[PDB]
Write a protein that binds this ligand. Sequence first.
Ligand SMILES: *[C@@H](C)[C@H]1/C(=C/c2[nH]c(/C=C3N=C(/C=C4\NC(=O)C(CC)=C4C)C(C)=C\3CCC(=O)O)c(CCC(=O)O)c2C)NC(=O)[C@@H]1C
Ligand SMILES: *[C@@H](C)[C@H]1/C(=C/c2[nH]c(/C=C3N=C(/C=C4\NC(=O)C(CC)=C4C)C(C)=C\3CCC(=O)O)c(CCC(=O)O)c2C)NC(=O)[C@@H]1C
Ligand SMILES: *[C@@H](C)[C@H]1/C(=C/c2[nH]c(/C=C3N=C(/C=C4\NC(=O)C(CC)=C4C)C(C)=C\3CCC(=O)O)c(CCC(=O)O)c2C)NC(=O)[C@@H]1C
Ligand SMILES: *[C@H](C)[C@H]1/C(=C/c2[nH]c(/C=C3N=C(/C=C4\NC(=O)C(CC)=C4C)C(C)=C\3CCC(=O)O)c(CCC(=O)O)c2C)NC(=O)[C@@H]1C
Ligand SMILES: *[C@H](C)[C@H]1/C(=C/c2[nH]c(/C=C3N=C(/C=C4\NC(=O)C(CC)=C4C)C(C)=C\3CCC(=O)O)c(CCC(=O)O)c2C)NC(=O)[C@@H]1C
Ligand SMILES: *[C@H](C)[C@H]1/C(=C/c2[nH]c(/C=C3N=C(/C=C4\NC(=O)C(CC)=C4C)C(C)=C\3CCC(=O)O)c(CCC(=O)O)c2C)NC(=O)[C@@H]1C
Ligand SMILES: *[C@H](C)[C@H]1/C(=C/c2[nH]c(/C=C3N=C(/C=C4\NC(=O)C(CC)=C4C)C(C)=C\3CCC(=O)O)c(CCC(=O)O)c2C)NC(=O)[C@@H]1C
Ligand SMILES: *[C@H](C)[C@H]1/C(=C/c2[nH]c(/C=C3N=C(/C=C4\NC(=O)C(CC)=C4C)C(C)=C\3CCC(=O)O)c(CCC(=O)O)c2C)NC(=O)[C@@H]1C
Ligand SMILES: *[C@H](C)[C@H]1/C(=C/c2[nH]c(/C=C3N=C(/C=C4\NC(=O)C(CC)=C4C)C(C)=C\3CCC(=O)O)c(CCC(=O)O)c2C)NC(=O)[C@@H]1C
Lengths: 162, 162, 162, 172, 172, 172
Amino acid sequence: MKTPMTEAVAAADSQGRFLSSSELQVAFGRFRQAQAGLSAAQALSENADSLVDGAAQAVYQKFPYTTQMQGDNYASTPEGKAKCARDIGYYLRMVTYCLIAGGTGPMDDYLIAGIAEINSTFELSPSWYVEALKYIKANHGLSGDAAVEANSYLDYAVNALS
Amino acid sequence: MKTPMTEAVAAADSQGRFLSSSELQVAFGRFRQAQAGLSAAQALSENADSLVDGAAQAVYQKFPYTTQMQGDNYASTPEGKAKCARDIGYYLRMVTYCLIAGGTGPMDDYLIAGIAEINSTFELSPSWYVEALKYIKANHGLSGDAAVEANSYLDYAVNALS
Amino acid sequence: MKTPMTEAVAAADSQGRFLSSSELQVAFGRFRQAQAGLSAAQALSENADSLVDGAAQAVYQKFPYTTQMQGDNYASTPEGKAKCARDIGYYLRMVTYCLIAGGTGPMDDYLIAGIAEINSTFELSPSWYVEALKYIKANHGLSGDAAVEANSYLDYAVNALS
Amino acid sequence: MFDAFTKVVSQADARGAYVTNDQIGALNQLVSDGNKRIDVVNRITSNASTIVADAARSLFADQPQLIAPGGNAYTSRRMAACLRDMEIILRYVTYAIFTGDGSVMDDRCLNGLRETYVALGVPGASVAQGVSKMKQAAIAIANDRGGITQGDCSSLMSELSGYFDRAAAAVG
Amino acid sequence: MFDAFTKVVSQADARGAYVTNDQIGALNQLVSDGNKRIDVVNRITSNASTIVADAARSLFADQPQLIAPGGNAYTSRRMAACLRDMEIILRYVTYAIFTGDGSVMDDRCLNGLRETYVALGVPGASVAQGVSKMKQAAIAIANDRGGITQGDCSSLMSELSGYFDRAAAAVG
Amino acid sequence: MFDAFTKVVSQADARGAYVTNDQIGALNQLVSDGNKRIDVVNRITSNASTIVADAARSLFADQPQLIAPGGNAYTSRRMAACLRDMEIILRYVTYAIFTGDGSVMDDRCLNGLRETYVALGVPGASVAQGVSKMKQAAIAIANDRGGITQGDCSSLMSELSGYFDRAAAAVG
Ligand SMILES: *[C@@H](C)[C@H]1/C(=C/c2[nH]c(/C=C3N=C(/C=C4\NC(=O)C(CC)=C4C)C(C)=C\3CCC(=O)O)c(CCC(=O)O)c2C)NC(=O)[C@@H]1C
Ligand SMILES: *[C@@H](C)[C@H]1/C(=C/c2[nH]c(/C=C3N=C(/C=C4\NC(=O)C(CC)=C4C)C(C)=C\3CCC(=O)O)c(CCC(=O)O)c2C)NC(=O)[C@@H]1C
Ligand SMILES: *[C@@H](C)[C@H]1/C(=C/c2[nH]c(/C=C3N=C(/C=C4\NC(=O)C(CC)=C4C)C(C)=C\3CCC(=O)O)c(CCC(=O)O)c2C)NC(=O)[C@@H]1C
Ligand SMILES: *[C@H](C)[C@H]1/C(=C/c2[nH]c(/C=C3N=C(/C=C4\NC(=O)C(CC)=C4C)C(C)=C\3CCC(=O)O)c(CCC(=O)O)c2C)NC(=O)[C@@H]1C
Ligand SMILES: *[C@H](C)[C@H]1/C(=C/c2[nH]c(/C=C3N=C(/C=C4\NC(=O)C(CC)=C4C)C(C)=C\3CCC(=O)O)c(CCC(=O)O)c2C)NC(=O)[C@@H]1C
Ligand SMILES: *[C@H](C)[C@H]1/C(=C/c2[nH]c(/C=C3N=C(/C=C4\NC(=O)C(CC)=C4C)C(C)=C\3CCC(=O)O)c(CCC(=O)O)c2C)NC(=O)[C@@H]1C
Ligand SMILES: *[C@H](C)[C@H]1/C(=C/c2[nH]c(/C=C3N=C(/C=C4\NC(=O)C(CC)=C4C)C(C)=C\3CCC(=O)O)c(CCC(=O)O)c2C)NC(=O)[C@@H]1C
Ligand SMILES: *[C@H](C)[C@H]1/C(=C/c2[nH]c(/C=C3N=C(/C=C4\NC(=O)C(CC)=C4C)C(C)=C\3CCC(=O)O)c(CCC(=O)O)c2C)NC(=O)[C@@H]1C
Ligand SMILES: *[C@H](C)[C@H]1/C(=C/c2[nH]c(/C=C3N=C(/C=C4\NC(=O)C(CC)=C4C)C(C)=C\3CCC(=O)O)c(CCC(=O)O)c2C)NC(=O)[C@@H]1C
């Protein structure tokens, strides 16, 4: 786990010294913009059920075989649909955490590190999750800076899967 | 301790991977020839008393001072003769182990590593043991490949002492 | 802690070997001259109260503000005078230890390593202690080699403070 | 490292003994089973990814707490580490069945693993369950009658089971 | 390393939960106190040398055995190491009040420090007393009404006190 | 590392004391015995290989289990390691009699040696017996009246015995 605030401390610590004027500026900037991320996280959280369920149905529409083909990797059973909606909710929750954290740290630590091994082992297509993320981007209803901050993390996840 | 089989595993392990096609060929070759070494070991074992006692008398004949001079390093007492026959039996047993193992590993681990320090400290002449080994080579009565395999380890010991 | 004797051992140890002819010569030389240092140490020890008290008054004479200015770092109180005389006694005791040891080791280990940090933190002027040391040099009453050996350690301390 | 042959040698040297006729006979039987042993190594190695994946799937179905949020295999990094450990243990089992001795797996994989898992908070009973699920799958694949000269591999399946059981015991 | 924000995230992830409105509200209050927090970091950092020196002087006055010949802070090297430790702990406290979480100080300074001091013979009760003397001085300086826009910093002083108290507990 | 002189200094510094006249007198007597001390170092060092070999021979005669197959000094590698340890300990004893203090032997040879031998399965009672056999031989050689100016070395032989006894105690 790192964020600009903890990287400022890590830099000072690596040199055995107290925080510098430049490191105090990291804190000024963080507190100047932190509320934007808190508000965007809260807005997404409040719409999580609609966004996750809508994203799952968007994936099933683009990839109809995922609800028809038999296999442990597919959403052709109630159990498979539940795994899929669960995973999409994980992605949305990670986006809210990044908004609260002021960086990618939560998504890096909890989701991206190891994702390629998971998807390979369990035969899950990264392209399925890309469509879920693009549905969320198109449907969160955030404006302006809030939209850019949320979209930055949705796009970061797409990139990690692409 | 290593053998071709364990070196095949050590190579795979050093690269964090499952055994390769080339490493499976090591096992095919080992099992194709292992019986030869087992049979040669068993033949030597069955003649161990004659070979050891004959080898000791061969050494005493070539180095008559070893049974006449007083000293802790010599075979001029019953105790010294017993130490000498014991040591020669160690060499023969190590040859049988190499035949069973399919390589020098047992003799390396149990006898050769440190032998120069032992012989220096206890004032034992390497040349005495060379004659014992050459008696064994001349008198084991093995033929063909069995003789070459036994002689390879007897000669390896001579080389280590020479 | 090191001395020529322990550095002779450290050299042998660093090479995994018994002491050399050259290292035995270190012991011959050490024992040839050790009594001189023992005698000089004993002479200083016997005059410690006079030397320390005289050195403190020499410092107060050269730096009159040290007994007039208020501050935790100054000798303007009984407590401050006691700290100052204590410190000067530490320096004299270290000189006697160097004379007994045959080198700077005791003063290095117990006084010089860290002295700059102490004097900075507690706002103690190194120049005060230099004057104490120069009073001791001028007033110990030792002659010849005894004077040079004592003065070598007094001068080593001055250098470390200068 | 021992193989079946050097294990016998090492135990004989500690007793100052020549390897006995009975021991020679047992090693000759191992040698005469050598093709079958290499088939076991080859079949498990060739199917390693599905042995790991299928055992892991089965473990998480039986132990749902491992994959609940907060569980020891939750987060992609922890899931990936768990799948890595399953593959590591299977890899060392293949080394043991290749050499005919468990020393490679003791010396390089299992010794200190109990303590490593305590320090990390990895639940060894669940590792052991994963290992036993890989055992079941590996025996079914290794001892499958399809596409091989017919004969008995029961001794090798007992020996193979023993290596999996040794790993399962070591982690708890 | 956590900051106040990632600490909340980490506790929520372990429960599979979105951060709640109450938690968002608490983080918003931390954000709205951000200038005051940076004043605390700045005031302690700017005065670090006198906080250490004055606390050390007070410690040795109260614990004279530390500076008697044979005591743990006797000799220049041991005194310098003791003053270094006081500065180290103050430095990690400033990191904790900067980030709004104590993890930096646990992970990089305090974890294993008890055991380090046992191995060295450093008396942790006296380290704790030094830490508490730095606490008193740091609060007096950080919460001084002179030369600052007037307002309430009581929440930050409680949080700051908590980091010093955490270090004091950890060393004994 | 201490020598006889710095050991006295170190004990005095811990008490804030000048070295006393009695202590000075004792160090003067050590100095006046300096030629004899160097003869001890020289005689043991010059005869180190035979001291080790003869003590080892005697150890194995008295403790035949060490050299039976399976014993801790059986195999050339273990015998060579055992002879190495005997030489190592004698080397550190010579350093102690050279410096007039046992700290070199505590700090660089004996501290943690008990635990090292437990981890290896080396029987410390037999190491101690080897050490005591080297002691007997080293005293006989060092205190031999042949080929030296006649005089009393009893104090040095007591001090030398003490270093061997210290090693013997430390390994068990
Ligand atoms: C138990 C494991 C099953 C079993 C084994 C079995 N194998 C053989 C014979 C052979 N196995 C091999 C192995 C390989 N040939 C290859 O090309 C490769 C890949 C590089 C391998 C690993 C070989 C060479 C043979 C001999 C020729 C043959 O194919 O027959 C037997 C026959 C007896 C023997 O030991 O030779 C048996 C019994 N058979 C079963 O039914 C078990 C389920
Ligand atoms: C408790 C700590 C005390 C306290 C704090 C307090 N601070 C402010 C306001 C600000 N603090 C700063 C900080 C800095 N400005 C700088 O130039 C630097 C150095 C780089 C720092 C660290 C700033 C920018 C402000 C805003 C502008 C201002 O000076 O007012 C307040 C006001 C409320 C607020 O949070 O903004 C308060 C209350 N005040 C006390 O009385 C406590 C003892
Ligand atoms: C107890 C150890 C035995 C003993 C010692 C003894 N030694 C001396 C005198 C000297 N010893 C030396 C040493 C050396 N000279 C060399 O050339 C070397 C090799 C580099 C060494 C190590 C020296 C220089 C002397 C002085 C000259 C001399 O040979 O006499 C004495 C005499 C008293 C003294 O301390 O000088 C003694 C007693 N003597 C015994 O009988 C003990 C068995
Ligand atoms: C949905 C887009 C599609 C789908 C999903 C599906 N996923 C699984 C199984 C797993 N998904 C994960 C993912 C995560 N675990 C984590 O810890 C995180 C980070 C917080 C992520 C993103 C994992 C690890 C698994 C496997 C283990 C488990 O079951 O939890 C399945 C089941 C696969 C199986 O073999 O059992 C399915 C069905 N499948 C589709 O067809 C949808 C379009
Ligand atoms: C025989 C050719 C001649 C002979 C032999 C002799 N050997 C010893 C003593 C030792 N021999 C060994 C050898 C080994 N120890 C091992 O562990 C191994 C590897 C498995 C070997 C080869 C050792 C270590 C010793 C010394 C310790 C011991 O006693 O076991 C002696 C006795 C020497 C003594 O000083 O006691 C003798 C007499 N001597 C001859 O004259 C023969 C021609
Ligand atoms: C005397 C020349 C002047 C003087 C002295 C003075 N010193 C202190 C305080 C300290 N002095 C030391 C020194 C040492 N400690 C060691 O362990 C050693 C090595 C053995 C040395 C040389 C230290 C560490 C301190 C501070 C801690 C302590 O009190 O022991 C003071 C008091 C400073 C304070 O702030 O309390 C004073 C007054 N001051 C003068 O004005 C004299 C001319
Ligand atoms: C999967 C069935 C279970 C599980 C596993 C899990 N393991 C780790 C971490 C480690 N595992 C090892 C093991 C080894 N590393 C090696 O190189 C070898 C061969 C010599 C072995 C056996 C190690 C060393 C680690 C720590 C370092 C690393 O992460 O790679 C984790 C991660 C723990 C964490 O909190 O980071 C996990 C999750 N967890 C389960 O729940 C299953 C029961
Ligand atoms: C001062 C109030 C007390 C005191 C302290 C003292 N500490 C040491 C030695 C060490 N302290 C540390 C601590 C750290 N090092 C780091 O890098 C960090 C941050 C990660 C910490 C917290 C360490 C590791 C040491 C040992 C190495 C070193 O000396 O630097 C000493 C020296 C002990 C000795 O005998 O050498 C002392 C004196 N002593 C007191 O009496 C006070 C109560
Ligand atoms: C001989 C009397 C006995 C004996 C000894 C024996 N020792 C070892 C192994 C080691 N001994 C040491 C000791 C040291 N190494 C150093 O560098 C120092 C000085 C700082 C010491 C004191 C160490 C570290 C080892 C382990 C590494 C190594 O082998 O060199 C062995 C080998 C044990 C093994 O199984 O490999 C043996 C046999 N054994 C006896 O039976 C005697 C009682």
